[PDB]
Design an enzyme around this catalytic site. Sequence first.
Site, PDB file in Angstrom:
ATOM      1  CG  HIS A 168     -33.855 -30.725  -9.189  1.00 27.69           C
ATOM      2  ND1 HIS A 168     -33.961 -32.056  -9.530  1.00 27.69           N
ATOM      3  CD2 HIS A 168     -32.593 -30.316  -9.421  1.00 27.69           C
ATOM      4  CE1 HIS A 168     -32.781 -32.396 -10.003  1.00 27.69           C
ATOM      5  NE2 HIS A 168     -31.932 -31.377  -9.960  1.00 27.69           N
ATOM      6  CB  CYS A 226     -36.476 -33.697 -12.038  1.00 22.89           C
ATOM      7  SG  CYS A 226     -35.154 -34.921 -11.996  1.00 22.89           S
TER       8      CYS A 226
END
Lengths: 363, 355
Positions: free
Chosen positions: B79, B128
């Site tokens: 992330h 992401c």
Amino acid sequence: DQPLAKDKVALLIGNMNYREHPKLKAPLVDVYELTNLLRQLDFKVVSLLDLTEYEMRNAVDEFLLLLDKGVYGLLYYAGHGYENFGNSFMVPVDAPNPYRSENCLCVQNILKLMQEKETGLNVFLLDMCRVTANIVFGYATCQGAEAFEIQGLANGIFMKFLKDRLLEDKKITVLLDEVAEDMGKCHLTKGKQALEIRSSLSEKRALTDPIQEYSAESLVRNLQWAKAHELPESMCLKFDCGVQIQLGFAAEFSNVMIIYTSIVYKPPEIIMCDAYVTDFPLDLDIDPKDANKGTPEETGSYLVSKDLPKHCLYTRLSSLQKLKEHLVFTVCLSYQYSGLEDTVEDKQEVNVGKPLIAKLDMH
Amino acid sequence: QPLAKDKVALLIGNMNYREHPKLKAPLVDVYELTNLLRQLDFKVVSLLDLTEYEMRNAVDEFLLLLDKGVYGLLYYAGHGYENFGNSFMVPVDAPNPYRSENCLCVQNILKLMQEKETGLNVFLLDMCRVTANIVFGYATCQGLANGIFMKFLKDRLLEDKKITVLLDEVAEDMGKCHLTQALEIRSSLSEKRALTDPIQEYSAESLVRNLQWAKAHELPESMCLKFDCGVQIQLGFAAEFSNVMIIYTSIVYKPPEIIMCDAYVTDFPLDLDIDPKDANKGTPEETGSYLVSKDLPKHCLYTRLSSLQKLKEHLVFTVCLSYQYSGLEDTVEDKQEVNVGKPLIAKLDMHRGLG
Ligand SMILES: NCc1cnn(-c2ccc(NC(=O)N[C@H]3COc4ccc(Br)cc4C3)cc2Cl)c1
Ligand SMILES: NCc1cnn(-c2ccc(NC(=O)N[C@H]3COc4ccc(Br)cc4C3)cc2Cl)c1
């Protein structure tokens, strides 16, 4: 398969005459040379010199309105710049000292505005002195002149290497990568000039791609170009004494026009015959000591001397973006008859409309 | 011909987030990139599921290897997010919503890399949602398959071409493919550098880099444990990642008078947080280990130790044996404590805190 451009448009800004910062020289030659190279690649170019903050903001905003789907855009800036908090800013000629970010154009804000376009190719080149948009960003930085160093019309470092590669039929990212490699080969560049290339280009796009004409969107772009390149028509002024003076006009930049006067006919009974221009609008801030020169070079005009006839008097009008009304001025004639001592005076007011960038309506 | 003084790489893959959705692609992507970089002669350290301090310490130690002429590659998968034009790498312990202070600023790392005299510095983010020669690949996206970026990168990474040209080809492949995921490439590379350039050693600087690699790859030797009843159990070790080791047990000898016996591992250090329900599996896949199954012998019991960076002292654990003699009903128990030292990333001395 062969990539095509819907259209090719470019805005070039060169800042040199700073009110509170050191004056630069390279943007004049760099903007002029890049304009001609982009014209060979069929770009519709608008090239502006010495813009204030509001002028810069308005010019960039109007360039961004041309960026319809499939269009290739190129924005080039040469002048002072600086980094603050990881953001880079373009410095207008009226910026205060020290630099304040509120008075400068944020490069990142412009990239974000460009990111929202459906352009075929968007190239942003900064030549500063310290669902895809297909953006290629070239960030060149050089040091400011050394105060005690020895300082003609030389190109800046970046433009010197860029002009040798710009006409290549190669992907713009490959082309800029070659430019970065050419500068790395030179020892004189090693500590005085850097280049960073940021790209999100996912297709084989090149400045040489052909252009795909009677649609409204296409006509809007052609009309903006045509207006910005419109020079006043030449005028033959007829005076009561029989003297005829031609007023000519030449373009150096989109906001810089040369005016010349020539004696086309002088009656035999007249010997002295001086024609000169005066009464320019106050917005233009023309210094009369620099007008009515015997050579174009004396007005600070070196680049278009080839397109100027000899034996004229030349005047350089370099802040056309500040002209908010029609260009109205006076042509004076000071003459002397054969056999007489007194000089006779005459004059006529001329209105030549809104020339070049001024045709786009300045506010 | 350009040469590398050395080639070093740090790969981080974050999947098991405490306060954010779990990811799967970093496991496969980090593993595949490790093998490709090994073919290019990079000394690679590949870490999975790092907390903020672990990420900071690993990046800081990778940056210390970047001496003059060295080629460095930093890869992050997990992330990430953008805030004020800055991008941040999100560690597994990050709270929700995200905070700049709990994440690693990509721009701060580029600035630290800018101060090095590296021959080539490559920073690839797979998130992401004397110049440093930095090339920065910023891929963004919105189940054992690779992630989109790694799928296109692995088809081009072994090419003997300038890294900028190679990443530009990757961006063009993704622009052709209807399936695609975005890619931005930032570069200040002024020389023809490629990941395939040869490595130009007995110098102290060279030895420091070899020693860090050697320690991070050190596995315990296989052991034959002999119990009082005569039963012998072989204990094995395999590496999946620099902070993930597989342990396996097998019965090598069972005396004829012992009608049945079972062996198993237990009492792992609490720092490792090993759930005993996931240890002693009949297959490596049941432990969450499917990448190294090829290098594991069959018919063993497998245990996955996946947080080796949290091991502060020696890895000490127990091998239990439960058996039954022929002619008897009751089951006899026995056990042996085993000390296998500090394996893999734990050999670099793991600590509480920053720096
Ligand atoms: N002090 C008074 C003042 C304040 N603001 N302005 C100001 C207002 C408007 C403009 N507009 C402008 O430059 N338009 C261009 C942009 O570049 C391209 C490029 C390609 C093509 Br095809 C067409 C065009 C059209 C400029 C200025 Cl300087 C003057
Ligand atoms: N919670 C406990 C805790 C807190 N911090 N740490 C921690 C401390 C230190 C490290 N050090 C580290 O990874 N070093 C590698 C970096 O990459 C390369 C790359 C190539 C080569 Br050749 C060698 C190396 C050495 C890692 C961690 Cl996870 C653990």
